Amino acid sequence: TEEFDIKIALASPDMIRSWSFGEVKKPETINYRTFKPERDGLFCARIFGPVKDYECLCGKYKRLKHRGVICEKCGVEVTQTKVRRERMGHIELASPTAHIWFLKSLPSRIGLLLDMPLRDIERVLYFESYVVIEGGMTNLERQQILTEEQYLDALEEFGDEFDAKMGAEAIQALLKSMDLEQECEQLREELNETNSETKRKKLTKRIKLLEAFVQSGNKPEWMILTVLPVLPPDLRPLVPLDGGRFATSDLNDLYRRVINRNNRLKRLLDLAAPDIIVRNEKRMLQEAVDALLDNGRRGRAITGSNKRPLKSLADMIKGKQGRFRQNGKRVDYSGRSVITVGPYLRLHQCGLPKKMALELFKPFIYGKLELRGLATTIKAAKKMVEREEAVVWDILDEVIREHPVLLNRAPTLHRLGIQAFEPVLIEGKAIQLHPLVCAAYNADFDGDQMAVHVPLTLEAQLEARALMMSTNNILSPANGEPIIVPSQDVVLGLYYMTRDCVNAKGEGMVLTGPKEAERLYRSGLASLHARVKVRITEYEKDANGELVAKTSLKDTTVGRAILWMIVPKGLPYSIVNQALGKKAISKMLNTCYRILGLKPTVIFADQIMYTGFAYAARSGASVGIDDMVIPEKKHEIISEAEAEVAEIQEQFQSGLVTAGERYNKVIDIWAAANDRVSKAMMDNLQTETVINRDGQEEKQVSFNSIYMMADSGARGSAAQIRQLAGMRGLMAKPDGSIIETPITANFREGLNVLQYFISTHGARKGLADTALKTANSGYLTRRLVDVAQDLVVTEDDCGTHEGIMMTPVIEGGDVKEPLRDRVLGRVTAEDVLKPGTADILVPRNTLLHEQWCDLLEENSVDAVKVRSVVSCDTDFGVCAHCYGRDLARGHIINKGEAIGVIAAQSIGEPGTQLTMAAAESSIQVKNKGSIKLSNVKSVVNSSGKLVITSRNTELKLIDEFGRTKESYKVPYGAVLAKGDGEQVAGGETVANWDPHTMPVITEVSGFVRFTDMIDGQTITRQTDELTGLSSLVVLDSAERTAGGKDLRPALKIVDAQGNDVLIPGTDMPAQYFLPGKAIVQLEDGVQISSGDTLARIPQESGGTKDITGGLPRVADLFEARRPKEPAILAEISGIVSFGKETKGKRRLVITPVPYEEMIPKWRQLNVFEGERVERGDVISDGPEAPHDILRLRGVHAVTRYIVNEVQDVYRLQGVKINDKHIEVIVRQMLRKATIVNAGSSDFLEGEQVEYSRVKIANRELEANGKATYSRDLLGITKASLATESFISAASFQETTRVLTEAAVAGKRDELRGLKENVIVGRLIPAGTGYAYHQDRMRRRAAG
Amino acid sequence: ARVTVQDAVEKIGNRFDLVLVAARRARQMQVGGKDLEENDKTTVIALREIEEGLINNQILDVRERQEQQEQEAAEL
Amino acid sequence: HARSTGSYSLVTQQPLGGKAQFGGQRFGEMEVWALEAYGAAYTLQEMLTVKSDDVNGRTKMYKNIVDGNHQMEPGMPESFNVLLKEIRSLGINIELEDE
Amino acid sequence: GQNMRVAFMPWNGYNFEDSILVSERVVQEDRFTTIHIQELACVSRDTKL
Amino acid sequence: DIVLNPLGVPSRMNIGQILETHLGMAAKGIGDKINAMLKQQQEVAKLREF
DNA sequence: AACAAAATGATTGACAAAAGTGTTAAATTGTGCTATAATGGGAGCTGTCACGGATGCAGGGGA
DNA sequence: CCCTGCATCCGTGATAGCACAATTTAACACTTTTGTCAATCATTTTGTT
Ligand SMILES: [Mg+2]
Ligand SMILES: [Zn+2]
Ligand SMILES: [Zn+2]
């Protein structure tokens, strides 16, 4: 068959008559006596080919010499019976019928084309009211709706020159008669005539469809059916079940009902029925045809002989969470079985039973048993594989020589769920599996099954060996850190071997190398960890790939020496001279990879496993019941807190205290007593043993068998050892409010009935979320991998200098992520230099691998500008330089890789598992650095206090190298200690505010005059003497009263003279608006000075359990949703002002050196009357929407926001993800642009930047300038429906709405994509198949 | 035998064309056009040639255009 | 379980099991993003063309395997031609521009 | 079920994950052996030939 | 007769199986105490008192 | 040492029961007819909730 | 006088007779097709003259 490269459009009644090979004019299906298909029926034989391979129906032409002769009795043609599977018929409707998809889908194409409301067309399809057609010279325009009674007088008056039809045939005379060009030429005016936004918004919506119906070449009346096509009889079969009963589809009930109501409608018209009956047949026919195509948009015509609704045609295509085609493919040559351990393996093999190796590899065996000459034919060989003779095991062992098989677990989260392995035949029925590999699959060996596939061809075994082998995947792709970490039990063997006692057998002696220690411990003389002195010769590669031995006299034990006999050459000895827990072993493998490559790191990750398994058995690390030790003072620490809780009950019962402080004063004695019973426990395990040296006594770290499992990191934490010995914490009641009485019993002691019942809700709630965090996370990683589906590295370099600034994110008093973790493996957008300039240490753009990353820490570089994929210049893809390095490998990214899919999984591999005093008055710095503020308008007052002016004042703790380490902020009532540049000791209060006092600082002293703060107007008048006490709470415009809303409270403070004392820094006088929750104690009548409060602003901010985030925060942050309360912004930089108020919402204006922007009424604004702001600065306070950051502050301002707000949910839970994987998804979220100016486009349509950037590269490159745009940002659910393919958007989203709109506009597919290429069944354009697609695109445009 | 193709990726530094250079060469052993073997299959022999430097994408083309000059001889 | 070749379904021609050799494993849409994450485009082109669905390309892969010649001539699956006849059985016309 | 002498210890990695390691005097004594009794039916239909 | 793993007790906190394992060995200590007294066929008075 | 000498499948038809191409029987099938009195009526569920988009009333505001 | 705001409503994810009248499947006969079969025609020495 010829190569195909796919279209879609409406179909005319004269094309549907071309697919069909005959008309279907009877509803009968089969014969009921003999089962030969009756004639003219649905399952006909003259129409849809013959039933038996090469034979007529009667039996005259049975032979094969007759290969095309159609019979003369019944005109069946003697061909193969697979032709019963590609042919179609057609029913000839006796009256038209509106195709439901193009009538009832939400924007009705029949509707917005004719310009008639959908409620008024549904009234005409049901014969409920006429509609005028070509009114002519009368008082009736073209689309009036004459009701059933109005029409009577109309025909009484005019008999001709007036035509009003009714039903489905009237909607055809409206569509068929309308002129598309006289409609579109005219509406070019009306879009420019009307001066209105919503008027000229829907007007262009109808002027675009009219311009998409004349360009594609479809008439409009093709949306009204005239002949219906029927499916081939073998895609809707009537196969006979075994036993005498037939098992039909349910498309034979909906086709046998369209042919009855259509055959009765022909009898009723040649019989001349009254019109009241043939209206109940037209409206009854077209209800059966609209249940065929899409069943459910009506009464839901339930099946017969049952009670469940039938399955229409649009329900087979419509998604089951997957397309009908390949997005599901069950597969041959496969098996599945239980997995077990098998720790004797290498890293690149796996067990495989002889009972699955002989059935997976069957046809490979019939090739050897005939090539080797044992069997004669292929049927005679089919018996030898049944009897299992002694030779087939000799041929099965030879077929499995170098043939890798693909093991794959059930819920494949990331790309390491499918790996290849070289099989080795074992006996049994369980697939063995190497221990280091199960941590990647995430598999326990307690009933987990694992399917095993088989790559057949020759280019599919060189891929299961070079690409998907098990020794090629040692670094995970989410972050470069290793994924072959020795997991749980081989790390308790390494730990036990490399510890040290204080007096064991063979202590203080001197050895002569690792071959002398292993020969000394196995002989029974020296204990495995006794402090010895040996001689070890370690190498080191310092020259151009050489090693130089270096003998020394190390101080170690017999344990660390026996383990030195495993480590490869180029490693130091201080790598094994620790106590070697679990983090130190995955760092021993991370260094062994960078220094020696992959050959020694695969042959060393095994020997570390054979030594951890072997020396862990010699432990016998068995956990008894003397292990988990209850502390001596678990009773007095609880009784003390048991009486101390009565002294807060006795006070309350006598009414001294309320209920609110009664609770929190009891929850803080238990939760602080729970810590003293735990902290008194780990001080009993950790220092358990007290051994004797040669003389006196001494203590050490314990060998308690339940503490070693928690200290090595083998299994468990330290927050779980406190439930076996300590106290069992506080347990939260069902709604979330914490229980007052805590379970004070461990698991080494029992739990009574009343405590074990309370601890059940904490368990039943955990199992109800772990089943929901998966079904909710398997839907976030499916929308991500459908927007980033078609991104592919397709070039080596683009040449753009635009990157993003990479600095370490510093969270208040501590830095969260160093600069090495953020820039490691990324090209440099420009050359960086030392603290002294013109000292360019890193050259032009180079991959910042380890050496350039340590060289940046060797110096004191503070920031680099690296190139990100969000700003690359290539069309349809990203360059290999913009992306970066990080991979399972370490080199730069290879051209042809598919970076769109491996970035949607590393974001979706987590989330399945992680679904979720504090005074702070004085700014406490943990370090000693100079204070250096920037971007602030505030100077010191009289008493030595810089007046707080706004929320623009942050604290930068400049280090000793010209960098920063801390970031802070400045609130109202901000007291200060130092200036700028004056050093401060660690933890000195430089700028402070009270928790329950955020008072109104006094900027300038002077009078207080009453402007909108007289009694009654904005604040009532309350009494007190001159001490300055009151509770005068000045309410804001959202805490404002009902009637008094034409005033906004403020104190236009005048100086001692009464004039306007202006705050130096602007032109406004001192009018310090009393901030949120203000208590103006200083009534009019008190004259104060600087520093004295104008209103007390408390703040509770308690508990900290009033926050949002988790998994719902990461799906909503990607959808780009408006967060219910936008923080408005200043669009254009200028000066501020107000306007007329009390329009329901206030208003505002900004003046550039006319712009208007209105505001709500509740908004406690953050600007004065006169103010000078910059483009894209806050005006109010609230969560800034994601779009507002894009339109105003730029594009790099939205990428630095989407990244840090999503990394802030992962790093809170201990998940590692390199943030290249959150920019190759943001890059696919803002690939649509809307046009402003034009000269080549239509000046108002929403095009793709892939296209709006080729014109301007084409026009502006020529001798004409002749457009300008503005990036859009739409979530990953609306950013995938709007692709340029329609098989990549129909396979995922709502399918009815995408084939409907793609059909009207007559779209086309290059496919040019992965999800649209896997469906047709060809080589994807990314990976090994990328070479062939470039070789095929250049076969077009050549020859 | 083979455990890692890290040697082969050194000569051909892509890993997406080493799978295409070795599938083309390994066909030739499989269909007996040619015999340059320690009881190995035809896909581990094709990787022990690339590992040694006797095969790449140019040595396969020029050895094919030297086939036509051979076929041109018998073409007469 | 184990299966090399057996009974194929009725409307879509993919494997299922009622004859002591049950259906093949399921190659979900999750196990296809793990073969596109690599560059495995020749393992993916056969895992859904020749091993499951293509009617006249999965028998040639059975005679090429017994004949010692590992190579496939894929074609186009049948699960897709059952999608061109159901999108055509609405009014919608859909075809393949041949070039 | 039966009750058999269990010992808690890591033994050369044949009980690495939750997996278990069973001696061979538990297979000689035949104490975990179960009996299973299936039913196969062979109906004789009446075809049309 | 069976060798379990001890690293499953600290993480999953089922400490029932570590006390049922000691009250198992205890109950089978009076097993091999009646199996020896009753094997030499000592007396029904030396057995009745144990 | 040649041609006695006698078959032995070729070579000829004859014979055979084997085998498709038409004439009536019996069971299958489709169409019509059937005047005492009949009259708007048939009819399943209900404990998901989420966001986002048109549609229509209402205020709210510029001429 | 004019464009412009809060609330529903909708789709989309997670009870016969007969007496007709016409139609069919099948049961019993044909002649070409192909076999099994020998009394001369053809291509094969057993061992005489
Ligand atoms: Mg499991
Ligand atoms: Zn026929
Ligand atoms: Zn680039």
Side-chain angles (χ1 to χ4, degrees), chain A residues 35 243 341 343 438 443 445-446 488-489 613 616-617 620-622, chain D residues 7-20 45 48:
Chain A
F35 291 144
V341 200
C438 73
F445 308 115
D446 65 357
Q488 89 169 7
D489 185 11
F613 273 163
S622 200
Chain D
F8 286 82
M9 66 177 302
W11 200 83
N12 278 220
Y14 287 111
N15 51 16
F16 165 69
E17 283 284 35
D18 304 17
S19 60
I20 311 183
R45 208 76 53 178
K48 45 168 40 60

Side-chain angles (χ1 to χ4, degrees), chain A residues 797-800 867 872-874 878-883:
Chain A
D797 191 4
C798 59
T800 294
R867 309 164 61 174
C872 178
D873 195 56
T874 316
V878 336
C879 96
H881 265 198
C882 285
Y883 186 77

Side-chain angles (χ1 to χ4, degrees), chain D residues 4-10 15-16 18 20-23, chain E residues 1-7 9 12 17-18 21 25 28:
Chain D
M4 37 194 46
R5 210 162 197 261
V6 129
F8 286 82
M9 66 177 302
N15 51 16
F16 165 69
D18 304 17
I20 311 183
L21 164 68
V22 161
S23 140
Chain E
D1 280 358
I2 290 205
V3 166
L4 299 172
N5 196 26
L7 295 175
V9 169
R12 322 92 176 254
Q17 66 177 14
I18 288 186
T21 302
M25 190 64 169
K28 194 94 166 49

Side-chain angles (χ1 to χ4, degrees), chain A residues 892-1103 1108-1187:
Chain A
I892 219 187
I893 181 72
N894 294 147
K895 192 208 326 298
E897 209 126 0
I899 61 179
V901 168
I902 96 179
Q905 297 175 325
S906 99
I907 290 188
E909 138 71 349
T912 260
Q913 107 242 142
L914 300 188
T915 148
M916 184 56 54
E920 300 170 357
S921 303
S922 293
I923 288 179
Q924 307 307 85
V925 217
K926 264 197 171 186
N927 299 340
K928 171 203 304 293
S930 75
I931 300 294
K932 290 197 168 183
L933 317 190
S934 54
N935 198 263
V936 181
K937 288 287 294 293
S938 153
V939 201
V940 176
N941 73 334
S942 62
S943 308
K945 218 299 286 187
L946 292 101
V947 56
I948 178 57
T949 45
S950 185
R951 278 69 204 96
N952 349 330
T953 324
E954 64 286 10
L955 287 191
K956 196 164 182 184
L957 178 75
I958 299 298
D959 58 355
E960 318 90 27
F961 286 165
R963 201 226 280 101
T964 157
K965 300 302 299 175
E966 314 297 0
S967 169
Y968 299 105
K969 201 59 51 58
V970 183
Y972 220 61
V975 69
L976 313 180
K978 291 304 184 69
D980 181 287
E982 277 61 16
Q983 286 73 243
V984 177
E988 157 154 349
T989 91
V990 52
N992 319 316
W993 75 95
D994 182 289
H996 269 324
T997 301
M998 185 201 318
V1000 189
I1001 176 194
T1002 287
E1003 184 267 354
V1004 62
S1005 190
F1007 291 163
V1008 183
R1009 214 194 301 175
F1010 264 166
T1011 166
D1012 296 333
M1013 301 197 59
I1014 355 279
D1015 53 329
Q1017 299 188 356
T1018 309
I1019 183 62
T1020 51
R1021 186 80 292 190
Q1022 310 201 27
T1023 178
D1024 196 306
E1025 194 55 13
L1026 289 71
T1027 61
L1029 309 174
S1030 72
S1031 177
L1032 273 62
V1033 189
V1034 182
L1035 294 158
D1036 83 321
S1037 183
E1039 298 168 7
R1040 183 60 33 70
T1041 321
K1045 289 176 305 181
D1046 46 87
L1047 295 176
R1048 316 305 201 186
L1051 290 164
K1052 192 209 299 270
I1053 310 176
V1054 303
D1055 51 357
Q1057 259 64 19
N1059 296 77
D1060 55 350
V1061 50
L1062 259 49
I1063 302 184
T1066 37
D1067 282 14
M1068 180 74 185
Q1071 187 177 31
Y1072 255 180
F1073 282 62
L1074 309 141
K1077 308 188 302 297
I1079 319 299
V1080 284
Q1081 64 281 51
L1082 314 187
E1083 312 167 13
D1084 249 18
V1086 297
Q1087 181 176 357
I1088 77 164
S1089 70
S1090 305
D1092 199 308
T1093 75
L1094 278 163
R1096 309 294 209 88
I1097 290 81
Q1099 181 172 9
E1100 297 183 4
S1101 188
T1108 70
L1111 187 50
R1113 176 76 158 101
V1114 179
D1116 156 56
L1117 188 38
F1118 271 125
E1119 301 276 352
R1121 307 190 176 186
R1122 167 190 167 270
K1124 269 186 50 63
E1125 262 297 348
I1128 34 267
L1129 269 279
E1131 286 71 348
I1132 194 60
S1133 299
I1135 192 73
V1136 200
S1137 168
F1138 291 163
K1140 55 93 191 299
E1141 301 190 25
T1142 317
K1143 198 176 66 184
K1145 297 179 301 298
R1146 203 153 67 92
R1147 206 178 43 76
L1148 154 68
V1149 174
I1150 322 172
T1151 282
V1153 291
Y1155 182 85
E1156 295 181 10
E1157 205 78 16
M1158 57 176 303
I1159 309 172
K1161 47 175 292 294
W1162 324 261
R1163 277 295 200 269
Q1164 201 182 18
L1165 206 51
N1166 292 154
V1167 63
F1168 294 96
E1169 219 301 321
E1171 197 271 356
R1172 169 197 185 280
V1173 76
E1174 193 180 11
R1175 172 174 235 269
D1177 183 13
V1178 286
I1179 280 327
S1180 171
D1181 188 66
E1184 72 288 23
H1187 326 305

Side-chain angles (χ1 to χ4, degrees), chain C residues 16-60:
Chain C
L16 60 89
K19 208 227 307 176
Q21 194 71 308
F22 292 157
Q25 295 312 130
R26 182 84 203 286
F27 211 56
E29 43 174 334
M30 303 205 72
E31 296 101 22
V32 172
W33 311 329
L35 288 184
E36 309 178 356
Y38 310 115
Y42 278 115
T43 285
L44 220 207
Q45 182 212 30
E46 77 168 5
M47 206 80 77
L48 49 76
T49 277
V50 139
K51 276 163 86 170
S52 102
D53 208 81
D54 203 290
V55 158
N56 48 38
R58 66 167 181 243
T59 69
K60 287 310 309 183

Side-chain angles (χ1 to χ4, degrees), chain A residues 726-982:
Chain A
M727 204 178 64
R728 209 202 177 289
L730 292 146
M731 263 302 180
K733 103 171 193 63
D735 310 327
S737 33
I738 269 53
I739 292 290
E740 187 158 327
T741 317
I743 306 178
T744 81
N746 14 43
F747 283 138
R748 189 186 186 289
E749 310 170 0
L751 283 65
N752 41 321
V753 196
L754 185 43
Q755 301 185 343
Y756 194 94
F757 189 85
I758 279 177
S759 109
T760 272
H761 177 89
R764 264 266 212 83
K765 159 74 140 305
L767 304 178
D769 295 5
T770 224
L772 163 71
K773 298 310 162 175
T774 73
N776 201 319
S777 160
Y779 173 55
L780 161 68
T781 165
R782 210 281 302 257
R783 299 182 287 186
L784 288 177
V785 80
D786 295 353
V787 64
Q789 184 83 135
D790 319 341
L791 207 165
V792 158
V793 172
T794 181
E795 192 174 338
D796 206 325
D797 191 4
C798 59
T800 294
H801 334 269
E802 279 66 1
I804 69 178
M805 194 71 53
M806 295 284 296
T807 71
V809 46
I810 299 188
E811 174 109 13
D814 265 320
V815 310
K816 288 295 307 189
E817 208 60 12
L819 187 56
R820 185 173 195 274
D821 298 15
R822 284 175 68 89
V823 73
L824 170 56
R826 274 169 154 285
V827 297
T828 53
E830 63 201 3
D831 29 350
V832 339
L833 13 86
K834 312 177 188 63
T837 74
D839 299 344
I840 306 178
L841 60 173
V842 299
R844 213 63 206 72
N845 41 37
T846 50
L847 218 83
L848 297 180
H849 66 105
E850 301 295 356
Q851 305 323 83
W852 301 112
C853 257
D854 279 333
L855 177 141
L856 297 197
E857 156 73 336
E858 243 261 357
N859 201 315
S860 175
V861 57
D862 61 84
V864 195
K865 153 174 286 302
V866 303
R867 309 164 61 174
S868 67
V869 51
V870 65
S871 76
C872 178
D873 195 56
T874 316
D875 298 319
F876 321 111
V878 336
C879 96
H881 265 198
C882 285
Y883 186 77
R885 147 193 186 177
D886 150 60
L887 298 173
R889 11 179 305 177
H891 313 147
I892 219 187
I893 181 72
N894 294 147
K895 192 208 326 298
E897 209 126 0
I899 61 179
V901 168
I902 96 179
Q905 297 175 325
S906 99
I907 290 188
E909 138 71 349
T912 260
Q913 107 242 142
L914 300 188
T915 148
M916 184 56 54
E920 300 170 357
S921 303
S922 293
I923 288 179
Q924 307 307 85
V925 217
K926 264 197 171 186
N927 299 340
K928 171 203 304 293
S930 75
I931 300 294
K932 290 197 168 183
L933 317 190
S934 54
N935 198 263
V936 181
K937 288 287 294 293
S938 153
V939 201
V940 176
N941 73 334
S942 62
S943 308
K945 218 299 286 187
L946 292 101
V947 56
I948 178 57
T949 45
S950 185
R951 278 69 204 96
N952 349 330
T953 324
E954 64 286 10
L955 287 191
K956 196 164 182 184
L957 178 75
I958 299 298
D959 58 355
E960 318 90 27
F961 286 165
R963 201 226 280 101
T964 157
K965 300 302 299 175
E966 314 297 0
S967 169
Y968 299 105
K969 201 59 51 58
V970 183
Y972 220 61
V975 69
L976 313 180
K978 291 304 184 69
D980 181 287
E982 277 61 16

